[PDB]
Structures are given as structure tokens and as C-alpha cells.
Amino acid sequence: TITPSLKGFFIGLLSGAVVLGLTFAVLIAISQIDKVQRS
Amino acid sequence: MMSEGGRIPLWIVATVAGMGVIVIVGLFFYGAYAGLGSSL
Amino acid sequence: MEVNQLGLIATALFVLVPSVFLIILYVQTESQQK
Amino acid sequence: MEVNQLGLIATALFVLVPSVFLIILYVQTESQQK
Amino acid sequence: METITYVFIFACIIALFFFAIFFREPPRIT
Amino acid sequence: METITYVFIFACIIALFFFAIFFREPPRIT
Amino acid sequence: METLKITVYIVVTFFVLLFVFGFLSGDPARNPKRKDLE
Amino acid sequence: ANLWERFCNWVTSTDNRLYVGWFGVIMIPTLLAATICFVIAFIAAPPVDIDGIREPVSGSLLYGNNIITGAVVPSSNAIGLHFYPIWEAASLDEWLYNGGPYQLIIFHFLLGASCYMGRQWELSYRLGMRPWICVAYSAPLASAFAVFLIYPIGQGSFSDGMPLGISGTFNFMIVFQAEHNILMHPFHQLGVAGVFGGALFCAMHGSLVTSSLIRETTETESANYGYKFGQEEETYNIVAAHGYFGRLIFQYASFNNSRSLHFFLAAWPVVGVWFAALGISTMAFNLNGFNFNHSVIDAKGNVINTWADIINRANLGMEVMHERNAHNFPLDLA
Amino acid sequence: RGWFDILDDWLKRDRFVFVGWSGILLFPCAYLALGGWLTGTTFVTSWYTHGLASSYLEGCNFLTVAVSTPANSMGHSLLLLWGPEAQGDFTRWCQLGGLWTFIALHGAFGLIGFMLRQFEIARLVGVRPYNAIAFSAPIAVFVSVFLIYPLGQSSWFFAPSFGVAAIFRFLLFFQGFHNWTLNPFHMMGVAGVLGGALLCAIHGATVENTLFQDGEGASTFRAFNPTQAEETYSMVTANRFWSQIFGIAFSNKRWLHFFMLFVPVTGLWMSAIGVVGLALNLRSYDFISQEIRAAEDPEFETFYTKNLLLNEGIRAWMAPQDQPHENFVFPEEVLPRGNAL
Amino acid sequence: VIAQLTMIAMIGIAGPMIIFLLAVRRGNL
Amino acid sequence: TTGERPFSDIITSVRYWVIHSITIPALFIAGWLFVSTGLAYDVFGTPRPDSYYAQEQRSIPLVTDRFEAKQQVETFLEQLK
Amino acid sequence: ARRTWLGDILRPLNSEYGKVAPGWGTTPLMAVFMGLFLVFLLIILEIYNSTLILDGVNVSWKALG
Amino acid sequence: PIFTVRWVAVHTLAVPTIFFLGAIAAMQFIQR
Amino acid sequence: MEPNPNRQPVELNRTSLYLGLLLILVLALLFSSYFFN
Amino acid sequence: MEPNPNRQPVELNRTSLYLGLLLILVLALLFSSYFFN
Numbered sequence A: 001t002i003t004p005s006l007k008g009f010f011i012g013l014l015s016g017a018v019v020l021g022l023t024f025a026v027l028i029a030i031s032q033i034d035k036v037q038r039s
Numbered sequence B: 001m002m003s004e005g006g007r008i009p010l011w012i013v014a015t016v017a018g019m020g021v022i023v024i025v026g027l028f029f030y031g032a033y034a035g036l037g038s039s040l
Numbered sequence C, D: 001m002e003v004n005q006l007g008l009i010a011t012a013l014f015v016l017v018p019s020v021f022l023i024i025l026y027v028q029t030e031s032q033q034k
Numbered sequence E, F: 001m002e003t004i005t006y007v008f009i010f011a012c013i014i015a016l017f018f019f020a021i022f023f024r025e026p027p028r029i030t
Numbered sequence G: 001m002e003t004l005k006i007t008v009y010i011v012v013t014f015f016v017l018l019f020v021f022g023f024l025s026g027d028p029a030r031n032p033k034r035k036d037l038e
Numbered sequence H: 001a002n003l004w005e006r007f008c009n010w011v012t013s014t015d016n017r018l019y020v021g022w023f024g025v026i027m028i029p030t031l032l033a034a035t036i037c038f039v040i041a042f043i044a045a046p047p048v049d050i051d052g053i054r055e056p057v058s059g060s061l062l063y064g065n066n067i068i069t070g071a072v073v074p075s076s077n078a079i080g081l082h083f084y085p086i087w088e089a090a091s092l093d094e095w096l097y098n099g100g101p102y103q104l105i106i107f108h109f110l111l112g113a114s115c116y117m118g119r120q121w122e123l124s125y126r127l128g129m130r131p132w133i134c135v136a137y138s139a140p141l142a143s144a145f146a147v148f149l150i151y152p153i154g155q156g157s158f159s160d161g162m163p164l165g166i167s168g169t170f171n172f173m174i175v176f177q178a179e180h181n182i183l184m185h186p187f188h189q190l191g192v193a194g195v196f197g198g199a200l201f202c203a204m205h206g207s208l209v210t211s212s213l214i215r216e217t218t219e220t221e222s223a224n225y226g227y228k229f230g231q232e233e234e235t236y237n238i239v240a241a242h243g244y245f246g247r248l249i250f251q252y253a254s255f256n257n258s259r260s261l262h263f264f265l266a267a268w269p270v271v272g273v274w275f276a277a278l279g280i281s282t283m284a285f286n287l288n289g290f291n292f293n294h295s296v297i298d299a300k301g302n303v304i305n306t307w308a309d310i311i312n313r314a315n316l317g318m319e320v321m322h323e324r325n326a327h328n329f330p331l332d333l334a
Numbered sequence I: 001r002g003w004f005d006i007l008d009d010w011l012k013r014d015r016f017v018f019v020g021w022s023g024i025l026l027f028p029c030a031y032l033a034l035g036g037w038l039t040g041t042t043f044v045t046s047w048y049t050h051g052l053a054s055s056y057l058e059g060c061n062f063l064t065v066a067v068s069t070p071a072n073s074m075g076h077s078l079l080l081l082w083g084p085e086a087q088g089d090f091t092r093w094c095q096l097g098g099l100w101t102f103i104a105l106h107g108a109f110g111l112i113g114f115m116l117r118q119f120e121i122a123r124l125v126g127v128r129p130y131n132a133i134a135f136s137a138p139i140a141v142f143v144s145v146f147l148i149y150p151l152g153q154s155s156w157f158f159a160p161s162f163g164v165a166a167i168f169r170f171l172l173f174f175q176g177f178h179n180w181t182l183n184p185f186h187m188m189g190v191a192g193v194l195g196g197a198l199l200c201a202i203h204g205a206t207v208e209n210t211l212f213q214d215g216e217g218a219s220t221f222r223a224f225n226p227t228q229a230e231e232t233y234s235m236v237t238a239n240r241f242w243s244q245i246f247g248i249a250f251s252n253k254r255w256l257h258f259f260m261l262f263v264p265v266t267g268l269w270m271s272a273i274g275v276v277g278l279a280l281n282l283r284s285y286d287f288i289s290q291e292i293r294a295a296e297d298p299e300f301e302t303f304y305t306k307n308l309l310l311n312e313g314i315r316a317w318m319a320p321q322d323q324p325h326e327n328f329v330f331p332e333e334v335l336p337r338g339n340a341l
Numbered sequence J: 001v002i003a004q005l006t007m008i009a010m011i012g013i014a015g016p017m018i019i020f021l022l023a024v025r026r027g028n029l
Numbered sequence K: 001t002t003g004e005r006p007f008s009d010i011i012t013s014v015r016y017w018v019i020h021s022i023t024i025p026a027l028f029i030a031g032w033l034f035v036s037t038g039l040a041y042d043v044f045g046t047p048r049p050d051s052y053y054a055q056e057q058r059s060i061p062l063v064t065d066r067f068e069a070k071q072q073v074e075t076f077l078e079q080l081k
Numbered sequence L: 001a002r003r004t005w006l007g008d009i010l011r012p013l014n015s016e017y018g019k020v021a022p023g024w025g026t027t028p029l030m031a032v033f034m035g036l037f038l039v040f041l042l043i044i045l046e047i048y049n050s051t052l053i054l055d056g057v058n059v060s061w062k063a064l065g
Numbered sequence M: 001p002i003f004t005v006r007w008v009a010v011h012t013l014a015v016p017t018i019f020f021l022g023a024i025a026a027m028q029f030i031q032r
Numbered sequence N, O: 001m002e003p004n005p006n007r008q009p010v011e012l013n014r015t016s017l018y019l020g021l022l023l024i025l026v027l028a029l030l031f032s033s034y035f036f037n
């Protein structure tokens, strides 16, 4: 069975994944747009 | 609405902001003697 | 006074072991060729 | 057993003091130029 | 013995001050 | 504590035998 | 105690006079640069 | 040259292994007297009636103390601020019972340390240095004056001066908190910022200069051999040091001017500790830490405790227990 | 070429606020720790955890505001917003002390972030990472005091609360309950801090007073150039001064600056070890020989026994309000008190 | 109350006013 | 230099103060109203001056149960009549 | 250097010093296992902490009998 | 709409600060 | 035997001896009271 | 200061170390019983 606290755990885990996922998506996006000049 | 720097002298900015700080902090000190936290 | 009866040897060895280590190292540095 | 409570420190220093003297002398001999 | 021990350590520290000051390796300008 | 002391000294002597034999300065003909 | 008191008073007076006469003995001139400061 | 001239030349000589100087002529005998009396008293002095209630406190090693509990115990509350030299006592036995060693030691010490400060000015002048090292030392000196002299003056007794011992110090501190709420005093708070800040900046500076040492040595030797005493060139790259620290925070929080940096290192702990000393020296006249006891009240008038009220309970515990036999009346007024 | 290298480029660009890979950990955690503290001290109570007002909103001032530890009944609960205690209710979370674990945990990861930043920046600029190494001392202190200590005790309740007066209470508790001043690990800590402040002052003063005249100005700061090859002050004159004043002096600038790292860093590390013992009540509370003598001899008195009487006062007088979960009722007649007071 | 705050602002502005006025007319600052 | 315009150039510009003569007073007033409307109490669960105790009680509403802490606080809040 | 019977046997096991797989190799897979390990640690921690409470898992001395 | 890291950094601090100062200003007039 | 090339001389200068002895003695002076208890 | 020409280096060879340590250890093994009494 899924206890309240296990549901709590899943909520925590997803939240963390979202924060990290969004942070990296945004940082990758920005880095792709704003490149360093070098050749 | 120019982004031109130096249009408002930095000494005026510093004085006004400085007086702003004094006023806000002064208010906080007043509050130590009135309403909540005043012991009264 | 009812002190710990190992305090004396603990203090003595605490001083002597590392002091001796340093003295050994110092003296053999001095004796090295200049 | 009711031994002399200074026997431990007496024995430990009896060994350590001259042993340390010898080790100091030995090591600084070794570190001298060949 | 405790007192002897404390005074001994203190006495060694004072002796160390003497050697550290008057028998230091002298600082030398190269 | 006495027993520890006696056995400790004995053990040091045995270790000394080991070094004196296997880690002696080798005799060399000049 | 009277003897101790007198002994200390003389000792203290002695060192204090050393201090005062010492600093009166041309102290500004005791530097490695400009000596004539009077 | 006459005898006095030669003497003055030797006293003020820049060539003595330890500088003497005119401040030194007072410093040397006074510090030797304080030191000798301290050492003899710490080892061998009998118990001292600190609080003037015929309840002698043992400070010395031979009378049952270790290094941590031992002290030279302050002079008797019956004495107060009265001058109690050996010659005012009927006997050494009386002088010892009443805490005479403490007065002898602290007065010689304070004079000697004041001259230590003057001596620092003095040698700087003889060597053609700038003069203000002595100003930095004025901070710990002021702090010593605060606990050995100014506090006793304000409270009316050398029995309230800081004891010359490790546990005696803690005693002084705890009683001080009970009686002045020093933790809640902004000058002690500035003191803490001074010493925490001093230790932080000590570590920071040390680490930054160490981080940027120019390679002058191999891996099998200490980097310290890469600097030679008296060399003309700097031993580390300050540009690298600044380039690191500026990026750690942001460019303009970093000092690039070494003179400005070293002035800041001097000033921060020195100013903080001057405030610490002034904390003790003004709490000496009972202008005490902030008191927010029952400052927060609800709509009905119920006291709503804050952390200040919890501090106050701890202070009360110290207050009611200290010198448990000395107070006959309800208020501790000094 | 390749998203990772592209991201690395951008993260490590020389901008006003350096970011780096470390910044991904550091900036959010440090921001949330600081923002957590400001939020709690401005708006949040400690009524349900401590029976205390703790915010500007309730009438506290800068000295008395705090973010307080959770109630003792919470034990060492992580107290996550979505956890079984608050169950996703933000208001209840605040009332249960959830901002305390919030700030402690984000603060811990932020400190990790900052030290990683020190490493990252040192590697990029090409300096040795001694600043990071030195930072291990603040980390040992934070971890031992805010994590290890309460973890050995009954609950987070006994960790320090984040506040000025709250921290003062923590000090006094450690005196009364742990006799913390008697602890040689704390004593070494004191030595490192005061010795560090001493070194800071004396070195700063020494440099400033052995400066070479490198300009005509009476204000001497202008007469320094960041790129100059020459020492700005005289090591030789400094050494002579201190040798003659104090008996010894530095002669080696590298040793000098390493020692400045060593002293306060070692001091803080030692104090951390003592606090780890205190997590377990493994105190330096007593000297047994002192107690045996004092128990048998009612005329034997030292400053050590005097301080224990103060400690006993502290415990009895502060415990009922400081430890409300215990429901202490100490009748007036059982309170230790000297005469009159 | 308001009279106190008004005197504050008037006296307080006066200093910066002397400086601002002189800066405007290239005075001997 | 790092590539951004200096702060001293920004905070002495007309554009800056035109923007911030609006945004600064606005944030300040929003903060004032967060408190003056009493919303701050409700968001954070901080007692108003009349919400520390019920009329007669002198006992603190201390949380004593880890897992029923939410309910306990709710109960305490109901007991405020 | 000295060859020995056992040294000859073990030789192949110390022969590929410095040999690498090109570029990122198995790094992406490693990251997955790291993430899974992190979640695992979080689970056992929250169980021990009583932040995660599971049916039939009584984290107490009275766990079995 | 072009932002900078510095711009973001400044405003994550400055924006709440002003809001909080308004809040605390208001608190000075609360009476029990 | 063929000599080991990894050998290095070890050093402790006088200042380090004095610093080290100071550390040890002061630590002993500090810890001794707790050893005797 | 001008160096002292009377200075001589001192030596203890390994065999002498071993002999000396044996003397000391065996003396300690002999006398230890009497020190404990």
C-alpha cells in the first residue's frame, strides 16, 4: 500500500527532479544561445 | 528616459538613499517604544 | 587528593614521545653535511 | 596485587630514556655523509 | 606528584623560551 | 599493569633479536 | 615592614628618576634620521 | 662621554638583543616582580578570603588545585579599593589570607604592560619606523585595564577584578553575565565581531597569500624555502590572489592595494577589541546590556516570552547562586 | 561542440558574479537559507515549539528575533514540507518549526557549494586551494554544532536557534549544563580565535608601520602599485623590531602567512571535536579529585567548585521555561539560592 | 509629531541645499 | 572590467530612477499592506496579540506529538473560542 | 626489476595502465546508477528518520519480537 | 527582454528586501 | 642489494623544533589536569 | 662568533645501538620486579 508518507516521499522526489530538471534545461538553453567566441 | 550615466549626481543619490536608511531605521527604533515589543 | 593514578605516566609519555621524535629529527638534520 | 604504584612509570622511563638516547645517536650517525 | 608534574611542564616551557630567543637560528639576509 | 609491563619489555627484546639478526650492519671484508 | 616600605620607595624612586631624566636626555635626537629637533 | 651619557647610550641602544629603552627601565623590574610573585603564589599561596566573609578560596597548586582550577585569588572585599601593599599588613600570613599577592601582581603587571606599549613606540622611533604598532597593542592592554582595574573601581572592590586563573576567569565571566547581561550589550557584540572577524580575516589572508606563492621549489621540499629573508621581490602573485578573491565574491569586494588590505587587518580586530574593552569599562558603571524582559505582551496583558526572557532565566540562576554566603539584603547593588 | 562543454563554457564565463558548476548548488541553497532566516525572523512565531515570540511581527527586535528549533516531540525529523508532520501545509510547517530544518539543511548544502566554489575558482585562476582548505573550519563548526550536536541529543529542539539572543541562550545553556568553559577542546578553540585575532592585528599593524616611503603623500596608501615587484614594507626592519621587543620574530614571510591560516583554522577544528563530545553529554564537567576532597572537607573551596554552584543555579532557574516539553514544576522551596538573593 | 518631522526635513535639507546650490553656480567648493 | 555597465553609471541615470521611483515605493507599500491587512498572520500562522491564549488559560500550546502535530495545533487554534 | 613466478602470473592484471575508453564512454549509465543510489539512500534515511512510514515496517526495537 | 546574471542576483535580494522593509515599517504601528 | 631511488633525506630546522616543543609542552600543560582528574 | 675548533662529530654504529638497547631492555626486565615490589 501507498502510505501517506510514501506519497509524501514521491512528491518530494518529483519536486526535486523538477527543480533540477528546470534548472539544467534553462542553463543548457542559455549556454546554447550565449556562446563564447573562439576559432 | 536615457540610459545615460551620470545624469543625476552620485552625491545626491548617496545623500537621499542615506537619509532614507536613517528614516527607516529611525522608524524601527520608534517601534521599540510603541505597540508590540514596547513592554507596555 | 584522589587523582587518577595513570595521570603521571600519561602526562610523562605525552611530553616525552613527541618531544623525542622532534629531537631525533633536529639533531640528525644538524649532523647532515653542510 | 598491591604493587608499588610508581613501578610502571619507573620501568617505562628506565627503558625509554636511554633507548631514546641511543636511537637519537644512531639516526644522526646514519644521516652523516657517506 | 600532580603538582610536581604541572610545575615541571611549566619549567620546561620557560627553558624553551630561553633557548628559542637566545639560541634561535639567526635570521640571515642572503 | 605489572604483567603488561613485563610482557611489553619481553616483546621488545624479541623484536630486538629480529632486527639484530636480519637487519644487522653486514660484516664486510675490506 | 617599615624597612620593606622604605626599600620599595627608594627602588621605585630610583627607576622613576631613570625614566624621567632618561627621556629628558635629548630623546628626540635618538632616531636614525633628522636629529636636530630642538 | 661621562657615565650618564654612556648609560643613556646603552639604554637606548638599537644593538641590544632585547631593546631596553626608558619605558624598559620601568617595564623590566615591574614585570619581573609581577611574574615572580605570580609564579610563587600560583604554586604555593594559601587560601584567600576573596569575598571578605572569612570563607577562604584555595587558588594554589600545593593547596589542591590543578592548572585549570588554580588561580591567584583577588584581594578581600573587606579591603575594597584600599591599597594593600605588604607593608600595610601585620605579617605575611595576614597579607596572604587577605589576597595581597593579587594587588602586587596586577599593579606591577598593568604598569609593566603600559610600559611595554610605550617601548613599542620607543623602538619604532629608534629604528626609523612608523609609530603605530603600539596603538594596535592598546586594544588588548585596554582590555586588561578593564578587567583588573576599571571594573574594580566602578564596583568598589578589587575582589571583583578578574582572578588570575583559568577557572577564575570563567567565574568572572558568568557573574558578569548575571549582573550586566553582557551578551546583550552592543560593545561586547562588536568585540565578538572583532575577534570572529579577526580570526576569519587571519585565515583568509593566510590562505590567499599561501594560494598564490610563486613556484621556487620542487615537490620534495617545503615551499617555505622559496622565500629568502630580506629578498627584494614579493614572494606571491598579488594579481593572482586578487583575481581569485574578486571572482569568489565579486571584483570590488577584493582588495588590490596591499596597504589598504593590511590596514584593514589591523583596524578590524583592534577597533572591535577597543569596543570590547569599553563594554567592560562602561558596564563597570552599570550601564548594562539591553533588557527586553517582558517586552512582548499579548492583548490581555499576558507576557509572551522571547529568547531574551530565556536568557533572563539563565541569568537569574547565576545571580541567585553566586557568592552564596555574601549577600544579606535583597538587591545586589555592587 | 556537445551540450556539456557548451554549458561548461557559459557557467565559467568571466562575469560580475561568477557562477560555475558550483553555483548550481550554492546559489539556490545560500539564497533559501538567508531568505528562510529573514522570512522567519520577520513573520514566524515560536509559540507552538517553544512558547516564545520570535518575529518582528510579534514585537521582537533585531536582538531577540530568531528562527527557532522545532518542538522536542519532533525528535530529529527532517520536517520536510511534504512530510508526515506538516503534510504539505505551509502554515502548519512554519508553526511546527519546519523553517529550522529548512535553513539548517539548505545552509549545510550552501556551505558545501561555497567551498566547491573556492575550489572551482582556484582551479580556473590557477592558484593553490588553501582558501577552500581554510574553509573546512567553518564547515566543521557548522556541522558539529547545528547537526551532530542535536543528533546526539533528544531532538533538534536543543540545536542552536537562528537568532542573536537565541544564540546567547545556547552559550549559557552550555555553561550551566555542559560546563563547556572547562573543556580543553573549547579552550584550544578560544586560543585559536583570540590568537588569530592577535595575528590579524599584529601583522596588519606591523606592515603598516614598516612601510617604505614610496611617495610624497602623508597618506601612504597611494604609494602602492598592484603590479610592483618590490615588498611594500621592510621584513628586515620588522624582524629587528619584534626580535628586540618580544624576543622572537618572523623571518620567513611564507611561514608567517601559513601560520595565519594554521592558528584560527586549528582552533575552530578543536572546538568542533569538543562539541561532538557534548552531543553525547561527554563533558569535561568535573575534576573527580576536587569533588572527593570537597565532599569530605566543607572548608575546601576553589574557583572550580564556585562555578559549579553557578551552573546548578543556571539549570534549576532556566530549565522549566527553557525545556517546556518536560513540564518541570520546581516549588519555590527547592530552588537553589544563596542568602538573601 | 508632524511639526517635529517637518522641522527635521527642513533643517536636514539645508546642508545638502548649500552644497547643491554652490555646485550649480560653480562655487568655491 | 566584467562587461556590464558600472553600478555608479546606472544609479545616477534618469532611466534608473524613473523605473525605481515606481517599483521601490510599490514593493514597500505591498509589504506594508501584507502586514496592515493582517495577511502576514494568516500565511505564517503567527498569533495576533489576542491569539496567544484563550481568556483564562496560562499554559502554552506546546506540540507534544510528532505525527499528530498538525492536528494538535489545529486543536489549540479551535480552543481560542 | 625482479621477475617471480607469482609476478609472471599476475602480470596481465597490471598491464593496461592509462588505457581509456574514448570520450564520455559509459558516463551516462554511471549517472543513472548514481541517481538511483541517491534515491536509495534517501529512502533508507527517511525510513530510519520516520519521515517515510511503510506498512509492516515498525522502525522500533519492537520491530519483530 | 535581455537579462544578466548580475541583474538577477541583485533583484533576488533587493526585491524581497524592500517588501520586507515595508512589512516591518507597518509593524511599528501594531498595538496589542 | 640495488639501492632504492625513492629515498629522501628528512629535515627539522631549529625553529620547528622550538615550535614543536612549545606545542607539546603547552598541550601537556593543558591536558595534564584532565589526565589526573 | 668565530667557530670552536674543539668540536668533534659523535657516532653510534648500528651494532652499538643493538647492544645498547639489549643492555637497557634486559636491565629493565631484571629491575622492573623490584621497582613494582
Ligand code: CLA
Pocket: A012, A013, A014, A015, A016, A017, A019, I024, I025, I028, I029, I032, I078, I079, I080, I081, I082, I098, I101, I102, I103, I105, I106, I109, L031, L032, L033, L034, L035, L036, L038, L039
Ligand atoms: C540544488 C538546489 C537545491 C538543493 C540541493 C535543495 C535541497 C533540499 N531541499 Mg530545497 N529548493 C530549491 C533548491 C534546492 N533544494 C529551490 C530552487 C526551491 C524553490 C522551489 C526549493 C524549495 C524547497 C522546499 C519548500 C523544501 C525544500 C527541501 C529540501 C531538502 C529535501 C529535498 C528532497 O527531499 O528532494 C527529493 C528529490 C530529489 C533529491 C531529486 C532526486 C532526482 C533523482 C536524481 C531522479 C532519479 C532519476 C534516475 C537516475 C532515473 C533512473 C531510471 C531507471 C528507473 C531506468 C533538501 C535539503 C525541504 C526541506 O528543506 O524541509 C525542511 C522542503 O520542505 N526545498
Ligand code: CLA
Pocket: G007, G008, G009, G011, G012, G013, G015, G016, G019, G020, H025, H026, H027, H029, H030, H033, H083, H084, H085, H086, H087, H103, H104, H105, H107, H108, H111
Ligand atoms: C621600576 C621599578 C618599580 C616600580 C615603578 C614599582 C611599583 C610599585 N611597587 Mg614594586 N618593586 C620593585 C620595582 C618597582 N615597583 C623591585 C625591584 C622590588 C624588589 C625590591 C619591588 C618590590 C615591591 C613590593 C614588596 C611591593 C611593591 C609595591 C609597588 C607599588 C607601590 C609602590 C609605592 O608605593 O611607591 C611610592 C613611591 C613614591 C610616592 C616616591 C616616588 C617619588 C617620585 C619622584 C614622585 C613622582 C611619581 C609620580 C606618581 C609621577 C610619575 C612620573 C610620571 C609623570 C612619568 C607599585 C605598583 C607594593 C604593592 O605592589 O602594593 C600592592 C608592594 O607591596 N614593590
Ligand code: CLA
Pocket: H113, H139, H140, H141, H142, H143, H144, H146, H147, H172, H173, H174, H176, H177, H182, H183, H188, H191, H192, H195, H196, H273, H276, H277, H278, H279, H280, I171, I172, I175, I194
Ligand atoms: C562564542 C562566544 C563568545 C565569544 C567569541 C566571546 C568573545 C569575547 N569575549 Mg565574551 N562571553 C561569552 C561568550 C563569548 N565571548 C559568554 C557566554 C559570557 C558569559 C558567560 C561572556 C562574558 C564575557 C566577559 C565578562 C568578557 C568577555 C570578553 C570577551 C573578549 C575576550 C578576548 C579579549 O578580551 O581580548 C582582549 C585581550 C586581552 C584581554 C589580552 C591582554 C593581554 C595582555 C596585555 C598581555 C598578557 C601577557 C601574558 C601575561 C603573557 C604572555 C606570554 C608570555 C610568554 C609573553 C572577546 C571579545 C572580555 C572582554 O570584553 O574584555 C574587554 C570580558 O571581560 N566575555
Ligand code: CLA
Pocket: H173, H195, H196, I034, I137, I138, I139, I140, I141, I142, I144, I145, I170, I171, I172, I174, I175, I179, I180, I181, I186, I188, I189, I190, I193, I194, I267, I268, I271, I272, I273, I275
Ligand atoms: C574569550 C571568549 C570566547 C571566545 C574567543 C570563544 C570562541 C569560540 N567559541 Mg566559546 N563561549 C565562551 C567564550 C568564548 N568562546 C563562554 C564563556 C561560553 C559559555 C560556556 C562559550 C560557549 C560556546 C558555545 C556553546 C559554542 C562556542 C563556540 C566557539 C567557537 C565559535 C567559532 C565560530 O566562529 O562559530 C561561528 C559559526 C561558524 C564559523 C559556522 C559557519 C558560519 C557561516 C560561514 C556563516 C555564513 C553567513 C552568511 C554568509 C551571512 C549571514 C546573514 C546575516 C544577515 C546574519 C570559538 C572557538 C562554538 C563551538 O565550539 O563550535 C564548535 C559553540 O557551539 N562557545
Ligand SMILES: CC(C)=CCC/C(C)=C/CC/C(C)=C/CC/C(C)=C/CC/C(C)=C/CC/C(C)=C/CC/C(C)=C/CC/C(C)=C/CC/C(C)=C/CC1=CC(=O)C(C)=C(C)C1=O
Pocket: A019, A020, A023, A027, H201, H204, H205, H206, H208, H209, H238, H241, H242, H245, H246, H249, H253, H254, H255, H256, H261, H264, I017, I019, I023, I024, I025, I027, I028, I030, I031, I034, M005, M006, M008, M009, M010, M012, M013
Ligand atoms: C535550482 C536553481 C534555480 C539553480 C540556478 C543556479 C544559477 C545558475 C543561479 C544564477 C542566478 C543567481 C546569480 C542567483 C543569485 C542568488 C543569490 C543572490 C544568492 C545569495 C547568496 C548569498 C547568501 C551570498 C552572501 C553574500 C556574501 C558572499 C557576502 C560576503 C561579502 C563579505 C562580507 C566580504 C568580506 C568583506 C571584505 C571587504 C573582505 C576583505 C577582507 C579580506 C578577507 C581580505 C583578504 C585578502 C583579500 C584580497 O583581495 C587579497 C589580494 C589578499 C592577498 C587577501 O589576503
Ligand SMILES: CC(C)=CCC/C(C)=C/CC/C(C)=C/CC/C(C)=C/CC/C(C)=C/CC/C(C)=C/CC/C(C)=C/CC/C(C)=C/CC/C(C)=C/CC1=CC(=O)C(C)=C(C)C1=O
Pocket: E006, E007, E010, H039, H040, H042, H043, H067, H165, H166, I187, I188, I189, I191, I192, I195, I196, I198, I199, I202, I203, I204, I206, I207, I235, I238, I239, I242, I243, I246, I248, I249, I250, I251, I262, I263, I264, I266, I267, I270, N023, N026, N027, N029, N030
Ligand atoms: C606556576 C605555574 C604552573 C604557572 C602557570 C599557570 C598558568 C595559568 C599557565 C597557563 C597555561 C596555558 C598556556 C594555557 C593555554 C593552553 C591552551 C588553550 C593552549 C592552546 C593549544 C592549541 C594547540 C590550540 C589550538 C589553536 C592554536 C594552534 C593556537 C596557537 C596560538 C598562537 C601561538 C598564536 C600566536 C601568538 C603570538 C604572540 C604570536 C606572535 C607572532 C609574532 C612574533 C608577530 C610579530 C611580527 C609580525 C609581522 O607582521 C612581521 C612582518 C614580523 C617580521 C613579525 O615578527
Ligand SMILES: CCCCCCCCCCCCCCCC(=O)OC[C@H](COP(=O)(O)OC[C@@H](O)CO)OC(=O)CCCCCCCCCCCCCCC
Pocket: H132, H133, H135, H136, H263, H266, H267, H270, H271, I204, I205, I208, I209, I218, I219, I220, I221
Ligand atoms: C579618523 C577615524 C578615527 C579613528 C578610529 C580608529 C580606526 C583607525 C585606527 C586603528 C588602529 C590600528 C593600529 C594602527 C594601524 C596603522 O598603522 O594605520 C596606518 C594607516 C595609514 O597611515 P598613513 O600615515 O597613511 O595615514 C595616517 C596619517 O599619517 C594621515 O595621513 O592609518 C590610517 O589609515 C588612519 C585612517 C583614519 C581614517 C578612518 C579609519 C577608519 C575607522 C573609522 C571608525 C569607524 C568604526 C566605528 C563603527 C563601529
Ligand SMILES: CCCCCCCCCCCCCCCC(=O)OC[C@H](COP(=O)(O)OC[C@@H](O)CO)OC(=O)CCCCCCCCCCCCCCC
Pocket: E010, E013, E016, E017, E020, E021, E024, E027, H018, H224, I245, I246, I247, I248, I249, I250, I251, I252, I253, I255, I256, I259, N013, N015, N016, N018, N019, N022, N026
Ligand atoms: C621584554 C621581553 C619579553 C620576553 C618574554 C618572553 C617571550 C617568549 C616568547 C615565546 C618564545 C618561544 C617561541 C618558541 C618557537 C619559536 O622559537 O619561534 C620562532 C619562529 C621564527 O619564525 P621564522 O619565520 O624565523 O621561521 C620560519 C621557518 O624557520 C619555519 O621552517 O617564530 C614564529 O614562528 C612566530 C609565531 C610563533 C609564536 C609563538 C608565541 C608563543 C607565546 C607564548 C605561549 C606559551 C605560553 C605558555 C605559558 C605557560
Ligand SMILES: CC1=C(/C=C/C(C)=C/C=C/C(C)=C/C=C/C=C(C)/C=C/C=C(C)/C=C/C2=C(C)CCCC2(C)C)C(C)(C)CCC1
Pocket: B011, B014, B015, B016, B017, B018, B019, J011, J012, J013, J014, J015, J016
Ligand atoms: C553623502 C554620503 C552618505 C550620506 C550622508 C548623509 C545621508 C547625510 C546627511 C546629511 C544631512 C541631512 C545634513 C545636514 C545638515 C544640516 C544642518 C547642519 C543644519 C543646521 C541647522 C542649524 C544650525 C539651525 C539652527 C536653528 C536654531 C538653533 C534655532 C531655531 C532656528 C534654526 C532652525 C535656524 C553616505 C554615508 C551614504 C555614503 C557616502 C556619502
Ligand SMILES: CC1=C(/C=C/C(C)=C/C=C/C(C)=C/C=C/C=C(C)/C=C/C=C(C)/C=C/C2=C(C)CCCC2(C)C)C(C)(C)CCC1
Pocket: B021, B025, I031, I032, I034, I035, I036, I037, I038, I039, M012, M013, M016, M017, M018, M020, M021
Ligand atoms: C523561506 C521559503 C522560501 C523563500 C524565501 C525567500 C527567498 C525569501 C526572502 C527574503 C528576503 C531576501 C528578505 C529580505 C530582507 C531584508 C531586510 C529586512 C532587511 C533589512 C535591513 C536593514 C534594516 C538594514 C540595516 C542596517 C544594517 C544591516 C547595518 C548598517 C546600517 C543599517 C542600520 C543600514 C520559499 C518560497 C522557497 C519556500 C518555503 C520557505
Ligand code: OEX
Pocket: H051, H077, H155, H159, H160, H175, H179, H322, H323, H326, H332, H333, H334
Ligand atoms: O563580590 Mn564578586 O559578585 Ca559584584 O555583585 Mn555584589 O559584589 Mn559580589 O555579588 Mn554580585
Ligand SMILES: [Ca+2]
Pocket: H299, M031, M032
Ligand atoms: Ca488592545
Ligand SMILES: [Cl-]
Pocket: H171, H175, H321, H322, H323, H324, I306, I307, I310
Ligand atoms: Cl561565585
Ligand SMILES: [Cl-]
Pocket: H326, H327, H328, H329
Ligand atoms: Cl548584602
Ligand SMILES: [Fe+2]
Pocket: H205, H209, I203, I257
Ligand atoms: Fe600579509
Ligand SMILES: [Mg+2]
Pocket: B030, B031, B032, B033, B034, B035, B036, B037, B038, I059, M027, M028, M029
Ligand atoms: Mg512596536
